[PDB]
Design a protein around this ligand. Structure first.
Ligand SMILES: *[C@@H]1O[C@H](CO)[C@@H](O)[C@H](O)[C@H]1NC(C)=O
Ligand SMILES: [Mg+2]
Lengths: 107, 108, 185, 504
C-alpha cells in the first residue's frame, strides 16, 4: 500500500524547541506503526546497517529458490532453474533438487 | 572527489569539494585538515606528503591536489601492482569557535 | 476527551480596576462562549497572596460562571506570578479538586507581564507545567505590550509558539484558536 | 544594579531535554480511510535540542505486510541560541576547560549578551553562591562566539552544567543544561614519606606526547602582559601539524599587530578572519602549526590587553595536540600569581572544596555599631566566637596558616574546646595581604559549624566569605584617645554578650 510521514500543520515557518507539532501519517488500514526520531548527529557518527524497504526486498529476493535468470538446457532445466519440479507419467522429469543453496560450489 | 575513482592520467590530479554543515540546517565557516591514504585489502598505507591545511568558505570549499605533487610521493612509480589499491580521505575541520571538531572520511 | 480549563488572573496593584473588570468579564465570556461539552473550569486570583475563587468540584456542582465570577475582588498585593503557577499545577490539577487523568489541561494566565517579589523562578515551574503537560494560554493586559521585557515575560510564560498563545484581552478572537483546536480533538 | 534591562537568570528556562534518540512510539491506524488511506495526525512536543529531527517508521499490517517509509525531516531552530561543547571522560578533582558557543543567525542585528556560568557546589568555579559570574559580550549578526570556562569537577558521575545567556533591548534568552561523566583517579601516592600521619583515628574494626611550558609575564611600557609558551615533541622523528587552542583571561585580547607579525612567521599560519577579527569580543584564538620538533624548545610570545576592568580573572587556557589526535592532548592553564594557573581549592585524602569566595565578610562599612555586630553574632549560624592571639604562622604558596591561641571559650557550638588550646585557622594565599594580619596580636573571631576543616581531633579552621575576624590590642594599646571608639564597642559587645549570653 503506502505509508507517509509529513507535517500536518504546513502553516509553520520553522519549528521551535518545546512546541507541539501536528504529524500527518498516511497508511495501511488497521496497521501498527513503529516510530523513531533520531538526532541526525548520530548519523554523523555512523550510518552503516540502517533499515530500508529496499534492503528488506533484497533479503526476500536473495531468498528466492530459483537459481537462473532465464531458460535451461532442456524442458527440465527451465523448471529447475526457476525453482520448479516437473514430473509426468511418461518418465520425463526435472533433475533432482538436493541442495537448499544455489548450485555454485564455493560461491 | 569529482569522480568516484582516481583516473590515472587525469592531469588535473584531483579536485575535491568539501561540504560542511550544521545539523539544524545552516552552513559552517572554518578551516580544514585533509589527509589521504591507500588501502590494499586489509593493508592500509598512509600518504604523509599530501596533507593540506585549507580554509572553509561559507559552507563551501574547493581543494586541489596538483598532479605534480601527487606523483612525487609514489613508491614504485608505475606498475600493474598499483591497480586493486583504493584511496581513503580523513578530514579534520575546526570551527572559528576553536571548540567543536569533526573527523570525516571518504573511503573506497 | 476531557476538557480541563483553569483560569489565573493577576490581582496586583498594577492591574487598574478597568483592566480587572475586563478580565473578570472576559473570563466569563470565555467560559460562556466555551459552552460546550466536557470542559471544566477553575479559577484562582494571584498577586502577593493567593486565593482560589472556585475549584473544579465547586464548578461541576455550579455551572453558572456568572455566579462564580461576580464575588471576585482585587488583591492589590505584589505579583507572585511564578509562585501562582505551582499553586495551579500542584492544587488545581489535583484529583482532589476534580481533576481527571488524561484530560486536556489548559491554563489561562491573565496578567500584565510584571512578576515582582516572587521568590520562585520560572526555570522550575514552567518545565513543571510541561512535564505535567498543561497547554498555557496567556492574556496580556493594559500596557502589557508597551514594554519590551513585559511582552517577552509573556512568551516566557506562554508555551511555544507564543504567537499562537499570547493574546490581548480586548481582542475577541482569543477563544477561536482554542475553541477550534478541540472541534476534532 | 547598573542597568535594569535584562531578563533575570532566575527566569531563564534553559534547554533541558537532549536525547540522542526518542519517540519509540507504536500507534494504530483506526481512521476511516479515504482513497484507501487512513490518515493519522499525532500532535507531539519538540525537544529542547536544536537539530533536524529525522523520523523513521514501519507499517506492519497483517493483510499487506510490512512497509518502510520515506524518513521525515522536521527542521528545528531559534534565531539566537547556544550549544555547549564538553568532553566525555573527565576526571574528578582535576581542573578542566569547557567551551560555550553562542550562535546568532539574525541577519543584520548585532547583540549584547550578559551570560552567566551558573553556580554548582559539585564544581569549583568562579561562581560562588552569592558572587555571580556574568560576562558581557557582543555578537555580529550571522556569527557565533566561543566562550571558555575552566572549572573543577568536585564530585563523580553524571554532572550537569548550566549557562543562561540573556540579552539587552531585545526579546529571547536561552540556557544550556547538559550532563556528562565524571570519574576518579585513585593514586594518592605522590612522594609519600613512610609515616606521614595521613591515617585517621576512627577507621578500622598527562601530556605523554607533548612538552608544554606556558608562563604569562608582564610588560615594560589599560594593562598589557606577555604570554609565553614553550613546546616540544617526545619521539624518534619530528611530528606533523600541531594545533593550539588558546583562550583569554576574562576580558583579554592579543596585540592585533604582533599577532600579524607572528603569522608571517616561519612554520605558522592563522587565517585572516580569526586574525582580523574585531577587538570587541576577540576572546578565543586558534593557531595551527606546520610541524613541531622533538629536538629542542621552540617558544613564542605576544601581548595581551585588558578590555574590561574586573578584579578577578578566569585563568587562560592553552590546549595543544597533533592534527590527527585530540584525545592525547595536553592542557595548561595560566595565571600570573597562581602558579600553573589553577584555581584555589582545599584538599584532603580524596575530597576537595572550592576556596575562591570573598576572603572574609566585607569590612570598612559606615556601620560598625554593637547593633549590627551583635546581629551577626546572634545569628544561629555562628557556631563559635573565640578571642585568641596570633601565635604562629605557616606561610606557603597554597595557603597561609595562622596559629590561633584560644584562651577563653566565649561561645562554643558543635565544638569541644579546652582552655589554653592551640588551633589552626587557614586563609588562602590570594587573601593574605588584604587581611593586614600580624602575629602576637589578639584576635576576636567567629564563624560557623560548617567552617571546620577535618574531623576530630585532627581538625583545622577556614576563613570564608562570611567569617568575621578582628584584631584585639592589649590593655596598653587601647588607652589612646583615638583608639577609644574601637575599644568601647569591644567592651560593651563582650559584657552584654557575656551577661545576657545569647538571647536564644
Ligand atoms: C603531585 O605533587 C605536585 C607537587 O609536587 C602537585 O602539584 C600535584 O597536585 C600532585 N598530584 C597529585 C595527584 O597529588
Ligand atoms: Mg502588580
Amino acid at each position: 500500500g503506502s505509508l507517509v510521514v509529513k507535517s500536518g500543520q504546513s502553516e509553520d515557518r520553522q519549528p521551535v524547541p518545546g512546541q507541539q507539532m501536528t504529524l500527518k501519517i498516511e497508511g495501511d488500514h488497521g496497521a501498527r506503526v513503529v516510530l523513531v526520531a533520531v538526532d541526525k548527529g548520530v548519523f554523523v557518527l555512523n550510518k552503516k546497517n540502517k533499515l530500508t524497504q529496499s534492503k528488506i526486498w533484497d533479503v526476500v529476493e536473495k531468498a528466492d529458490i530459483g537459481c537462473t535468470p532465464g531458460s535451461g538446457k532442456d524442458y527440465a532445466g527451465v523448471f529447475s532453474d526457476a525453482g520448479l519440479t516437473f514430473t509426468s507419467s511418461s518418465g520425463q522429469q526435472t533433475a533432482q533438487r538436493a541442495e537448499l543453496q544455489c548450485p555454485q560450489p564455493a560461491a | 572527489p569529482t569522480e568516484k575513482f582516481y583516473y590515472i592520467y587525469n592531469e588535473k590530479g584531483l579536485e575535491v569539494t568539501i561540504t560542511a554543515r550544521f545539523l539544524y540546517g545552516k552552513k559552517v565557516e572554518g578551516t580544514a585538515f585533509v589527509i589521504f591514504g591507500i588501502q590494499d585489502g586489509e593493508q592500509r598505507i598512509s600518504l604523509p606528503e599530501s596533507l593540506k591545511r585549507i580554509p572553509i568558505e561559507d559552507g563551501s570549499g574547493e581543494v586541489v591536489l596538483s598532479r605534480k605533487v601527487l606523483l612525487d610521493g609514489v613508491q614504485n612509480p608505475r606498475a600493474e601492482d598499483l591497480v586493486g589499491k583504493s584511496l581513503y580521505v580523513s578530514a579534520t575541520v575546526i570551527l572559528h569557535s576553536g571548540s567543536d571538531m569533526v573527523q570525516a572520511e571518504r573511503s573506497g | 476527551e476531557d476538557s480541563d480549563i483553569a483560569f489565573l488572573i493577576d490581582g496586583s496593584g498594577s492591574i487598574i480596576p478597568h483592566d480587572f473588570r475586563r478580565m473578570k468579564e472576559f473570563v466569563s465570556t470565555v467560559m460562556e462562549q466555551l459552552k460546550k461539552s466536557k470542559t471544566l473550569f477553575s479559577l484562582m486570583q494571584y498577586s502577593e497572596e493567593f486565593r482560589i475563587h472556585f475549584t473544579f468540584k465547586e464548578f461541576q456542582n455550579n455551572p453558572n460562571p456568572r455566579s462564580l465570577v461576580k464575588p471576585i475582588t482585587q488583591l492589590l498585593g505584589r505579583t507572585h506570578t511564578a509562585t501562582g503557577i505551582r499553586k495551579v499545577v500542584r492544587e488545581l490539577f489535583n484529583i482532589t479538586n476534580g481533576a481527571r487523568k488524561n484530560a486536556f489541561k489548559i491554563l489561562v494566565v491573565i496578567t500584565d507581564g510584571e512578576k515582582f517579589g516572587d521568590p520562585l523562578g520560572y526555570e522550575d515551574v514552567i518545565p513543571e507545567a510541561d512535564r505535567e503537560g498543561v497547554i498555557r494560554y496567556v492574556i496580556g493586559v493594559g500596557d502589557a505590550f508597551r514594554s519590551e521585557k513585559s511582552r517577552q515575560e509573556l512568551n516566557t510564560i506562554a508555551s511555544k509558539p507564543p504567537r499562537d498563545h499570547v493574546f490581548q484581552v480586548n481582542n475577541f478572537e482569543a477563544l477561536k484558536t482554542i475553541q477550534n483546536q478541540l472541534r476534532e480533538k | 544594579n547598573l542597568d535594569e534591562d535584562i531578563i533575570a537568570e532566575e527566569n531563564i528556562v534553559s534547554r533541558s531535554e537532549f536525547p540522542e534518540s526518542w519517540l519509540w512510539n507504536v500507534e494504530d491506524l483506526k481512521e476511516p480511510p479515504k482513497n484507501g488511506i487512513s490518515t493519522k495526525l499525532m500532535n507531539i512536543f519538540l525537544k529542547d535540542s536544536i537539530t533536524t529531527w529525522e523520523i523513521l517508521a514501519v507499517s506492519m499490517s497483517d493483510k499487506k505486510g510490512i512497509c518502510v517509509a520515506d524518513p521525515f525531516e522536521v527542521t528545528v531552530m531559534q534565531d539566537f541560541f547556544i550549544d555547549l561543547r564538553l568532553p566525555y571522560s573527565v576526571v574528578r578533582n582535576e581542573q578542566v576547560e569547557i567551551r560555550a558557543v553562542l550562535y546568532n543567525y539574525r541577519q543584520n542585528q548585532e547583540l549584547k549578551v550578559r551570560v552567566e556560568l551558573l553556580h554548582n557546589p559539585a564544581f569549583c568555579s568562579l561562581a560562588t553562591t552569592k558572587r555571580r559570574h556574568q560576562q558581557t559580550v557582543t555578537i555580529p549578526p550571522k556569527s557565533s562566539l566561543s566562550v571558555p570556562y575552566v572549572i573543577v569537577p568536585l564530585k563523580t558521575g553524571l554532572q550537569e552544567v548550566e549557562v543562561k545567556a540573556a540579552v539587552y533591548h531585545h526579546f529571547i534568552s536561552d540556557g544550556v543544561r547538559k550532563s556528562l561523566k565524571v570519574v576518579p583517579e585513585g593514586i594518592r601516592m605522590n612522594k609519600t614519606v613512610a609515616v606521614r600521619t595521613l591515617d585517621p583515628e576512627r577507621l578500622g574494626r598527562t601530556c605523554n606526547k607533548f612538552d608544554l611550558k606556558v608562563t604569562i609575564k608582564p610588560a615594560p611600557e589599560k594593562n598589557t602582559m606577555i604570554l609565553e609558551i614553550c613546546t616540544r615533541y617526545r619521539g624518534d622523528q619530528d611530528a606533523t601539524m600541531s594545533i593550539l587552542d588558546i583562550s583569554m583571561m576574562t576580558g583579554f585580547a592579543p596585540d592585533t599587530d604582533d599577532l600579524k607579525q607572528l603569522a608571517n612567521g616561519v612554520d605558522r599560519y592563522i587565517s585572516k578572519y580569526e586574525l582580523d577579527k574585531a577587538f570587541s569580543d576577540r576572546n578565543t584564538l586558534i593557531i595551527y602549526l606546520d610541524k613541531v620538533s622533538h629536538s629542542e624548545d621552540d617558544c613564542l610570545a605576544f601581548k595581551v590587553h585588558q578590555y574590561f576592568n574586573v578584579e578577578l580573572i578566569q585563568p587562560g587556557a592553552v590546549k595543544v595536540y597533533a592534527y590527527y589526535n585530540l584525545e592525547e592532548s595536553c592542557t595548561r592553564f595560566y595565571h600570573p600569581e597562581k602558579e600553573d594557573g589553577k584555581l584555589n581549592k582545599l584538599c584532603r585524602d580524596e575530597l576537595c572544596r572550592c576556596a575562591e569566595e570573598n576572603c572574609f565578610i566585607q569590612k570598612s562599612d559606615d556601620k560598625v555599631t554593637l547593633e549590627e555586630r551583635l546581629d551577626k553574632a546572634c545569628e544561629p549560624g555562628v557556631d563559635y566566637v573565640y578571642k585568641t592571639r596570633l601565635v604562629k604562622v605557616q606561610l606557603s604558596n597554597d595557603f597561609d596558616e595562622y596559629i590561633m591561641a584560644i584562651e577563653q571559650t566565649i561561645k562554643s557550638g558543635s565544638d569541644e574546646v579546652q582552655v589554653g588550646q592551640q588551633r589552626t585557622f587557614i586563609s588562602p594565599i590570594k587573601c593574605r595581604e588584604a587581611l593586614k594580619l600580624e602575629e602576637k596580636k589578639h584576635y576576636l573571631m567567629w564563624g560557623l559549624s560548617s567552617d571546620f576543616w577535618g574531623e576530630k581531633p585532627n581538625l583545622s579552621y577556614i576563613i570564608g566569605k562570611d567569617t568575621w575576624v578582628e584584631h584585639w590590642p592589649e590593655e596598653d594599646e587601647c588607652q589612646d584617645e583615638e583608639n577609644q571608639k574601637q575599644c568601647q564597642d569591644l567592651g560593651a559587645f563582650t559584657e552584654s554578650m557575656v551577661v545576657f549570653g545569647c538571647p536564644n
